[PDB]
Design a binder for this molecule. Structure first.
Ligand code: MG
Ligand code: MG
Ligand code: NI
Ligand code: NI
Lengths: 205, 205
């Protein structure tokens, strides 16, 4: 249950930031000595709560969905990925033409979009593409911006390799994406250049 | 990655209730037509946020911790289990004498306490015991109250059996607890009586 626990640790870490923020915000509201910050506290509760909703709507499909056969609308996927990009620096350029997407496609695309975002820790553009053609659905996310970089744990996860030294959270997501694309019969590919990275997957459709 | 995804689905489902509540609460604050409920809305945001913190502090150790060697204080565990019992009907009677507990003991006890609570869907007492003796640490939770009941999915999970028809959320927790107690070298036992159930585990210590 080592894999499962690492994924749970990931989820907990992402949710804990905005949840702590709400708590803090409300502590400030009640503290008779911080009345100078009432409005910033109230804004922080509102925004954190929105951040949490966005992260939970996303995590339910990206991580929580089952292997079971089910189509999603790509517009709804755009919406989930847009929600997660709202709370980090890079911008999202979603280019999948609206259409229904099978379940591996859908779990795959959401994960790919976020790995692309977290490859851009000083901003940039994550361009998301996805075409149904030739008995497949083929996804590619291009991340572009300063110091764009797939960390080593991400790359080892995307190849299904154990985690060496590097962070569990980035890894578990990448390995999870690898395992689900392999169980589906497809393949992961990566490109790395100067100020750029891209992550690609195909799956049968 | 089927097991991992089910655990993620569990986590998401538990967190989504109070997070939606906060969102709703704040929608009521802003809605110029529900000003009649301003105080109940504000109370609901405060309480939901507290519920979330309690669930996240608990989930980080119950689910998120690694197999890696690490002691916890039982008082701190009491605190985590108390937090989760705050948001359901049954009451908790923690009887572990304060002492350090190894990692399998600790993941085990937290899970056992909550399974005991969710066995009491119309209230009652979950009594939690835990003794270090004879090269072991041995935990038992007794749930007592009307219609106390280990559901079939819980029992199949506690034995490591696949999930048949029954709910994924109760199951995944029980299987996760089984896998971690087995990887540690210990065993799970269950008792079932009228208006009572108990779940027990030992692990080497
Ligand atoms: Mg996440
Ligand atoms: Mg939970
Ligand atoms: Ni577009
Ligand atoms: Ni006590």
């Amino acid at each position: 249950p080592d894999f499962a626990a690492m994924l749970a640790a990931r989820l907990c870490h992402d949710f804990i930031s905005p949840a702590s923020a709400i708590v803090s915000g409300l502590d400030l509201l009640e503290d008779p000595s911080a009345q100078d910050m009432r409005d910033d506290a109230m804004n922080l509760i509102a925004s954190s709560a929105r951040k949490l909703a966005d992260l939970l709507q996303f995590t339910r499909v990206a991580f929580g969905a089952s292997a079971s056969a089910e189509n999603f609308d790509s517009r709804e996927l755009e919406k989930l990925a847009q929600g997660v990009f709202a709370h980090v620096r890079p911008t999202l350029d979603w280019q999948i033409e609206p259409q229904a997407m099978n379940k591996p496609s859908s779990r795959a695309v959401l994960n790919i979009a976020q790995i692309a975002a977290s490859a851009l820790p000083a901003g940039g553009v994550a361009t998301v593409k996805g075409v149904a053609a030739d008995g497949r659905f083929s996804i590619i996310a291009d991340a572009k911006g300063p110091r764009a970089r797939l960390r080593p744990e991400v790359l080892a996860g995307l190849k299904g390799e154990p985690l060496a030294e590097g962070l569990g959270g980035p890894w578990v997501q990448a390995a999870y994406l690898n395992a689900l694309v392999r169980a589906a019969g497809g393949q992961i590919a990566v490109e790395i250049g100067e100020d750029r990275a891209s992550i690609a997957a195909w799956v049968p459709a």
